[PDB]
């Protein structure tokens, strides 16, 4: 049982680091308001922060950091539901933020004085849809969650792993990145192309990061149904599970990366003026 | 069994009301031909009318309004197949009609004399695929239908509720609502933006209406697998199922809402001219 | 067992014919390099050729042309995994090739001297994702493959037919053609429309061919779960399977069809110049 305590400490350390990172993003977003951002960006970025907080909070309860002993089936289903709600919302919020910025930057209207009320209305309507769709997509998982017996956490049973991977694959990489690739391909041959490749390079490394964090875990879960103390098959499950947990500290860093055309330059101006007078 | 008889009356009244509404749309579409619309609109709208008629006809048989006693497994599977064919076709026809009109209105070419043969050819091929995909997508639900024993209808069992919701979610609001949002987001920053917000307001309330009608019934069916005369869990199933039945009287009203840029103004000219001389 | 041997000969003959066709496509692509194509086309077409080779090789092992007797569960799962990897990659590669060429031809920049380094970078990054997604999407198949008993080949059990059709429907005609139809619908109403209808007429017949080759086999497999020596239900399964195997000789013919705007004219110039001097 010594390995279980070590795994509990490692997950808790990652989450505490991730929680500090999220608070830094919240503070960074707060000081970025001086460089007037469009309401569309503000709606998407703030909803991303809320979704990340839900995923971080539910992940620790899923790993049983402090709820060991009281983790029944009712709590296991509720925790797994909240985790996927943040998991699904982040994919949709990032997809809409990328699409909003790709269209805005390409047409040359990405500043505060370049957006209308209708632009803000679409962002609010898109955010409301993404929240509701995430709840609906996470309903099947709330009716199939079960306790973990190798470890002391919460995880969907292996018999539903194939269905779980299919929903996750479409929601995280199937739909969001086919739509992004279709838009980029059309954007690559258009006249509104010169000032979009800096942003396109950011969305390429973002989906690669998402690809290398989500694929190893769910693919292994499906494969464990035929591959059959702890053994080698149990430590690799933990090894591929922490990679999923590291998304709580890497994804929040991409909120600023998609904030504007050159966030690293606007942030310096905002911070320099913040420390000078206000 | 008194409540069951009242259930048939409520569904039967809704179907008769919906049938009257559909006939009004058929008549309204007929009198709208004087304001000669593009062939692309005519192909989509008339195929929608055929799709709605299939859904209305199959829903009455699904509830067992007149087929009680003879509702075996073979008929229940066949009826559930036809009902989902109309359910899937309507989502695809509405998605293609919205996309066709959004592009046509934005570019300023939405009248009869602004379309070519190739525009009509795309609409014909898009309709042909949407009919075939609906048949294919409704094949799995034609091999898993079963008799309902709480009520005297015909519904998919609860063990396939998770799979049923996943297919329905993608078809009704998964693919069509992402594709529409992706186009609208691009349209919000383009020069072809001034005369598209009247139509965008119509597609926003349409998908909200679809969200309010479809989500509660299928989400409850999945949740009923874990929540476990009639009881409270049986009346809420009927309450959340009638909302699905009201789609037969609400969706046909959106056929004219997407007919053109300002259907409420073109309809008045068509009706006023028709009653005068022809 | 006489009919079983005949089926082995028919499938083997189709593969040998398909193998010759693929080698002709490889040779045809090699002689098409004189008419300098963009690197984006070269990346997509060559990756398509590799995917067809995987599908051709795995299909023959799946049918047990020469591996009868040693076809265990481990070999059956591996072969079925490879076949879907080629099957899924072809759908994604064809979708990206169509989208790349539709955008390039519409904007008037489809020649070698009209593409930039960023154009080739997107094609390389899109190909890398399509390979990874195909591997991930084929992972569930490797966990559910089983040995065939009515015949001596490899095929998914009928209990997973519903899940198999859902994944295949989305990958082959669900996502790729919704995105294609959405782009074409917008293209039909734009100014960049005059010189795209020759290509659009080519993607309409291609997807119809995919519709009539993939649908019958998977739709029948789901229906066989309720419809219940060899009988009529076993010969139709063979008849509906050779249509799937026939895709190995039809799909490679579409690699050159999507090569450029008018491949039948560029090929003649390339072949005539090759036989003259070099």
Numbering used by the authors:
A (entry chain B), B (entry chain A), C (entry chain R): 34 to 261, 269 to 318
Published text:
As a ubiquitous herpesvirus with a seroprevalence of more than 50% in adults, human cytomegalovirus (HCMV) encodes four viral GPCRs (vGPCRs) including US27, US28, UL33 and UL78. The first three show about 30% homology to chemokine receptors (e.g., CXCR3, CX3CR1, CCR10 and CXCR1), whereas UL78 displays negligible homology to any endogenous receptors. While previous studies suggest that US27, UL33 and UL78 regulate viral replication or reactivation, there is no existing evidence demonstrating their interactions with chemokines; thus, they are classified as orphan receptors.
Specifically, the inward movements (10.0 Å and 13.1 Å) of ICL2 and the intracellular end of TM7 fulfill the receptor intracellular crevice, thereby hindering the insertion of the C-terminus of Gαi. This intracellular closure is achieved by various interactions, including D133TM3−R134TM3−E148ICL2 salt bridges, D143ICL2−R301H8 salt bridge, R69ICL1−W145ICL2−H146ICL2−H147ICL2−R142ICL2 stackings, F127TM3−F239TM6−Y240TM6−F294TM7−F298TM7 stackings and I138TM3−V229TM6 hydrophobic contacts. UL78 forms a stable homotrimeric architecture through an extensive interface covering TMs 3–6, ICL1 and ICL2 with a large interface area (7956 Å2). A central triangle in the trimer was formed by the tightly packed TM5 from three protomers, while the extracellular and intracellular halves of TM5 were further clasped by TM4 and TM3 from one neighboring protomer, respectively.
